[PDB]
Amino acid sequence: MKLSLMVAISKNGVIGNGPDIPWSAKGEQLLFKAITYNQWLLVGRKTFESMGALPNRKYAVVTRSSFTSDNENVLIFPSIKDALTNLKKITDHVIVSGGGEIYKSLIDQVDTLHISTIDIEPEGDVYFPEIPSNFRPVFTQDFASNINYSYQIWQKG
Amino acid sequence: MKLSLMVAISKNGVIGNGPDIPWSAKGEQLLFKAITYNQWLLVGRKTFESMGALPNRKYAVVTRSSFTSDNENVLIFPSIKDALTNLKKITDHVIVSGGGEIYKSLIDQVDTLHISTIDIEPEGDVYFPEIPSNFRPVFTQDFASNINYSYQIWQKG
Ligand SMILES: NC(=O)c1ccc[n+]([C@@H]2O[C@H](COP(=O)([O-])OP(=O)(O)OC[C@H]3O[C@@H](n4cnc5c(N)ncnc54)[C@H](OP(=O)(O)O)[C@@H]3O)[C@@H](O)[C@H]2O)c1
Ligand SMILES: NC(=O)c1ccc[n+]([C@@H]2O[C@H](COP(=O)([O-])OP(=O)(O)OC[C@H]3O[C@@H](n4cnc5c(N)ncnc54)[C@H](OP(=O)(O)O)[C@@H]3O)[C@@H](O)[C@H]2O)c1
Ligand SMILES: CCc1nc(N)nc(N)c1C#C[C@H](C)c1cc(-c2ccncc2)cc2c1OCO2
Ligand SMILES: CCc1nc(N)nc(N)c1C#C[C@H](C)c1cc(-c2ccncc2)cc2c1OCO2
């Protein structure tokens, strides 16, 4: 089973402010929607509760409480380890989609990074892990918008 | 100035039938929308008419006729050499977006290919050109849909 990771990182490393993403760069959301279409996403409970279950995606949500969901596209797991154990039996690809705790736990296990660098330096308290040395960028594209952003795909190798 | 190329190819190389793309693969468009957001597209007249000027893209259209446009986001050029010469003045990046004739003319000059392979063998009379040997895939992601597709990015070198 392949593991991807998708995140938008502001220029100072902030990816979140409380439960929110502290920016709105018009168009960057299109990358997220395109790459995650009909994919399995692994998200922590805080980010899931904050984003909700968008259509045309499947969600594996991890929680140590007894958080539930009656949405048919949402599975809940008591641990990241159990999510992975089960996911590899029901799909061949999972996209790690946050938040901060989930990226910290999974960064060293993923095969492909999707990183949008957002041209802003906002206030926030959630950060992205430092990127392991074996990842290298293989594709880059710049976008002009209300807040500029740059999309970059990294591969392990 | 960098040139990219974005295309959706079916399994027998067909990309068009008359003016029409002879499939609809739900979700695939999102890739096109995401990658072309606020970008310059270089297109031939036939494709441009068939799609029209969808919003938040800028269009460079080639024609040998007197085809014109009122739209501020559309520029019309008598030749490819003229399109590229003029584009180099105002942008650092251009995405070649079709159709068959444009693709064939430009593929040897582009740096990056975005290819979605569409899991269908339709009838058509417009084919994508052969890919030059110095291109290599650097990223691949499968999507299941009403018609399956696979998205792959190629780099020259
Ligand atoms: N910028 C971006 O691209 C982006 C993307 C996604 C999220 N974010 C941001 O990230 C922030 C939220 O991140 P966060 O780190 O606070 O929370 P989070 O990672 O979204 O969720 C953390 C929760 O996940 C559960 N969890 C974590 N590790 C677990 C494990 N090993 N086993 C079982 N459950 C586990 C726990 O839920 P329980 O409390 O129920 O036990 C934990 O409280 C928000 O600001 C959001 O906007 C940004
Ligand atoms: N599957 C996909 O990803 C995809 C993407 C895009 C398009 N398509 C399909 O491809 C088909 C259209 O392709 P096509 O090859 O027939 O047409 P095209 O490449 O879109 O346009 C051809 C026209 O471009 C102009 N042209 C071409 N070379 C020129 C040059 N060197 N100088 C000046 N003008 C030039 C001419 O316009 P004038 O006739 O006005 O002089 C010519 O008729 C459609 O079915 C479309 O849907 C498929
Ligand atoms: C579009 C945002 C984004 N961009 C990139 N490049 N990578 C990501 N991983 C995310 C993300 C995200 C999380 C899942 C998220 C999505 C969304 C969201 C809601 C509605 N449409 C699109 C995304 C809202 C969120 C939210 O966390 C905080 O609130
Ligand atoms: C979405 C289709 C597509 N996928 C990929 N991966 N690459 C591409 N270059 C195109 C394309 C295209 C052309 C420009 C095109 C777009 C569109 C279009 C219409 C509405 N929203 C987005 C694209 C319609 C077209 C059309 O040609 C025939 O009719």
Q: What is the residue extent of each domain of chain B? A: 1-157
Cα distances (angstroms) measured from residue B46 to each of A127, B59, B73, B147: 47, 13, 17, 25
Torsion angle of the four alpha carbons B27, B32, B33, B37, in this order, in degrees rounded to the nearest 10:
160
- Which residue numbers of B have CB closer than 8 Å to A's CBs? 4, 27, 30-31, 33-35, 37-39, 56, 92-93, 112, 138-139, 141-145, 153, 155
Q: Which residue, among A134, A133, A149, has the nearest Cα to A21 in the 3D structure? A: A149
Q: What are phi and psi of B83, to 5 degrees?
A: -55, -50
Contacts of A139 in chain B (CB under 8 A): 112, 138-139, 153, 155
Q: Whose structure tokens read 């190329």?
A: B5
CATH 3.40.430.10 fits A1-157, yes or no: yes
What are the start-end ranges of the E strands in chain B? 2-10, 14-16, 40-44, 58-62, 74-77, 93-96, 112-118, 126-127, 135-143, 149-156
Cα distances (angstroms) measured from residue A127 to each of A31, B38, B81: 21, 28, 46
Rounded-to-integer distance, Cα A98 and Cα A70, Å: 21
Q: What's the distance, Cα to Cα, between the start and end of chain A in Å? A: 17
Rounded-to-integer distance, Cα A149 and Cα A143, Å: 5
Task: Decide: B85 and B94 in contact? Cβ < 8 Å.
Answer: no
Rounded-to-integer distance, Cα B58 and Cα B83, Å: 13
Q: Which residue, among A107, A117, A156, A90, has the nearest Cα to A10 in the 3D structure? A: A117
> B131 has which bridge partners?
none
Residues in chain A: 157
Experimental resolution (Å): 2.0
CB atoms within 10 A of CB B132: 13
Which amino acid would we find at residue A40? W
The alpha carbon of residue A33 is apart from the nearest alpha carbon of chain B, in Å, by: 7
